[PDB]
Write an enzyme that holds these catalytic residues in place. Structure first.
Site, short mmCIF file in Angstrom:
data_model
loop_
_atom_site.label_atom_id
_atom_site.label_comp_id
_atom_site.label_asym_id
_atom_site.label_seq_id
_atom_site.Cartn_x
_atom_site.Cartn_y
_atom_site.Cartn_z
N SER B 24 0.81 -1.22 0.00
CA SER B 24 0.00 0.00 0.00
C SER B 24 0.84 1.27 0.00
O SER B 24 2.05 1.22 0.24
CB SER B 24 -0.90 0.04 1.23
OG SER B 24 -0.14 0.29 2.39
N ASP B 135 -3.09 9.17 16.92
CA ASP B 135 -3.71 8.80 15.66
C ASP B 135 -4.33 7.38 15.68
O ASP B 135 -4.23 6.62 14.71
CB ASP B 135 -2.77 9.05 14.46
CG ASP B 135 -3.51 9.06 13.11
OD1 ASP B 135 -4.72 9.36 13.08
OD2 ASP B 135 -2.87 8.75 12.07
C1 LIG Z 1 5.84 -1.74 7.99
C2 LIG Z 1 5.17 -0.75 8.93
C3 LIG Z 1 5.98 0.08 9.70
C4 LIG Z 1 5.45 1.01 10.59
C5 LIG Z 1 4.07 1.12 10.70
O1 LIG Z 1 3.52 2.03 11.56
C6 LIG Z 1 3.24 0.30 9.94
C7 LIG Z 1 3.78 -0.64 9.05
N1 LIG Z 1 2.94 -1.44 8.32
C8 LIG Z 1 2.75 -2.80 8.40
C9 LIG Z 1 3.51 -3.61 9.24
C10 LIG Z 1 3.29 -4.99 9.29
N2 LIG Z 1 2.36 -5.60 8.55
C11 LIG Z 1 1.59 -4.85 7.71
C12 LIG Z 1 0.63 -5.50 6.95
C13 LIG Z 1 -0.18 -4.77 6.10
C14 LIG Z 1 -0.04 -3.39 5.99
S1 LIG Z 1 -1.13 -2.49 4.89
C15 LIG Z 1 -2.55 -2.35 5.77
O2 LIG Z 1 -1.39 -3.32 3.75
O3 LIG Z 1 -0.59 -1.17 4.67
C16 LIG Z 1 0.91 -2.73 6.72
C17 LIG Z 1 1.74 -3.43 7.59
#
Ligand SMILES: Cc1ccc(O)cc1Nc1ccnc2ccc(S(C)(=O)=O)cc12
Ligand SMILES: Cc1ccc(O)cc1Nc1ccnc2ccc(S(C)(=O)=O)cc12
Lengths: 277, 283
Positions: B24, B135
């Site tokens: 994403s 947030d």
């Molecule tokens: C990488 C990261 C770093 C820091 C942070 O605040 C968030 C993330 N995001 C994620 C971390 C582990 N799993 C995830 C799985 C899916 C998604 S999504 C919803 O598709 O954007 C994001 C993830």
């Protein structure tokens, strides 16, 4: 140069202290934290208690027991970790009335996760060698995922003897210790038997092993319905080979396990777990 | 902090990340899945500085059972990123609103999710010094392989030691609209309402500024039968909790500790097996 410090926990913050077990490296009790509102485990007795705590804090990873903090008081000294409600791999394999069925997918997932954990340790700088792997030290969390524990004997690269390689106890005395232990563990997981159960004296085990005897591999110990039987036997045998140089690294080991774990549908893991409840 | 024991966050060379796949794109950057070549685990990596690195410092210091676990950072001239454990079941947002893919979401799971978020935020608030998320929203509550909670997105977060704080409008208390310890609890209340209803808060209103006006006057999301059906376990004690947390007055809002204390008995009314059953139902 990002840093994190291990929180200090006041003993009066640990409510409902209930005994779990007594061990060589101290006593383990379960409790609840008054502020965080979570169950925890506490291991109480000094240089040793302080050491294990520093190791868990530095070695944090998905398959290592997660440390929550330390109790450092003149009255009480302890290591606080998350609570592992499903005990040890030793109990899962050997309490056959409590667990008559342990489906293959969960057995393989457990084996995969142990390898992942030890691999991570070996890949730290400097490398960390556990040197005390046994099924009693593989804890199982709320969802039956692995958390490796007991870092009392671990060494930075710079009881029972069934999991110990012959070269460690030959008269007039290693980076290939962990893999040896892993091979014995694998055999134990795939057979649900105690290695050398038929041998009453530990010295007879030590002598047999130094002479090249290993737990038995035949149809009675490892039945022919074991998924990927040939591949596992072959991994077990190289893992506990007499010559340490012939034992595989955990990378090799993982590259072997990977294709096996891909065969299991993700839902079969969840079904294997609910069958235990 | 005790005895002075320290743990350093590992640096991960970008080239050690194999099989990069886009997941994403948001405000704070792009998120991809990958596998670490040496560790042999799936990971998630968030890429585009002092901002990206700030979140890494917070995640690393706020490690806890219900906080997204950080594995390391990529710090290269070519690339900058945060590497965490991969969450295979996405966000709470996707679980609540993707009704075709998730036709049914059993009550015990919902309550376990609510309890875990509260435990996570409670831990943050109890840190020394306290950390405030600012947030919290359903898009920032990640779900792991067994649908346990991992709170993410610490981009707008602040340590407790003049323009208004950041956040997402719908989960933002009205006193933070123009130029507080009770921001998170307000967000939690909207999250709770959203979990129990599976509805968008303020769904009827197409104009976000109208929402801000309404909320300022005193309106909140719709609390009736249509939104919160009568068959909701403990509907009353829950509706009580939602309303006190989203009060107009910051001082009439409870601490997370008090919320926990209420929620514990409710969670104790569900048998362990019902949680596993809920998860198998989703797969
Ligand atoms: C990488 C990261 C770093 C820091 C942070 O605040 C968030 C993330 N995001 C994620 C971390 C582990 N799993 C995830 C799985 C899916 C998604 S999504 C919803 O598709 O954007 C994001 C993830
Ligand atoms: C506390 C601790 C610290 C350091 C360490 O190497 C191990 C532990 N032990 C434990 C940690 C979390 N959960 C456990 C659950 C059960 C048991 S048992 C097998 O009943 O003794 C021990 C546990």
């Amino acid at each position: 140069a990002i840093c994190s410090a291990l929180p200090t926990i006041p003993y009066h913050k640990l409510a409902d202290l209930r005994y779990l077990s007594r061990g060589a490296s101290g006593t383990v009790s379960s409790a609840r934290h008054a502020d965080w509102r979570v169950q925890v485990a506490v291991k109480h007795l000094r240089k040793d208690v302080l050491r294990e705590a520093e190791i868990l804090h530095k070695a944090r990873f998905s398959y290592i027991l997660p440390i929550l903090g330390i109790c450092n008081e003149p009255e009480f000294l302890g290591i606080v970790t998350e609570y592992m409600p499903n005990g040890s791999l030793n109990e899962l394999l050997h309490r056959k009335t409590e667990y008559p069925d342990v489906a293959w997918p969960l057995r393989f997932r457990i084996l995969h996760e142990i390898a992942l954990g030890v691999n991570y340790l070996h890949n730290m700088t400097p490398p960390l060698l556990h040197h005390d792997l046994k099924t009693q030290n593989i804890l199982l969390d709320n969802e039956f995922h692995v958390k490796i524990a007991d870092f009392g004997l671990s060494k930075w690269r710079m009881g029972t003897i069934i999991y110990m390689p012959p070269e460690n106890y030959e008269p007039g005395q290693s980076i290939k210790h962990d893999i040896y232990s892993y091979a014995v563990i694998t055999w134990e997981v795939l057979s649900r038997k105690q290695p050398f159960e038929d041998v009453t004296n530990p010295l007879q085990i030590m002598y047999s092993v130094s002479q090249g005897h290993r737990p038995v591999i035949n149809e009675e110990s490892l039945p022919y319905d074991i998924p990927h039987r040939a591949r596992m036997i072959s991994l077990i045998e190289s893992g506990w080979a007499q010559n340490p140089d012939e034992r595989p690294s955990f990378l090799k080991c993982l590259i072997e396990l990977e294709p096996v774990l891909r065969t299991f549908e993700e839902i079969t893991f969840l079904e294997a777990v609910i069958q235990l409840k």
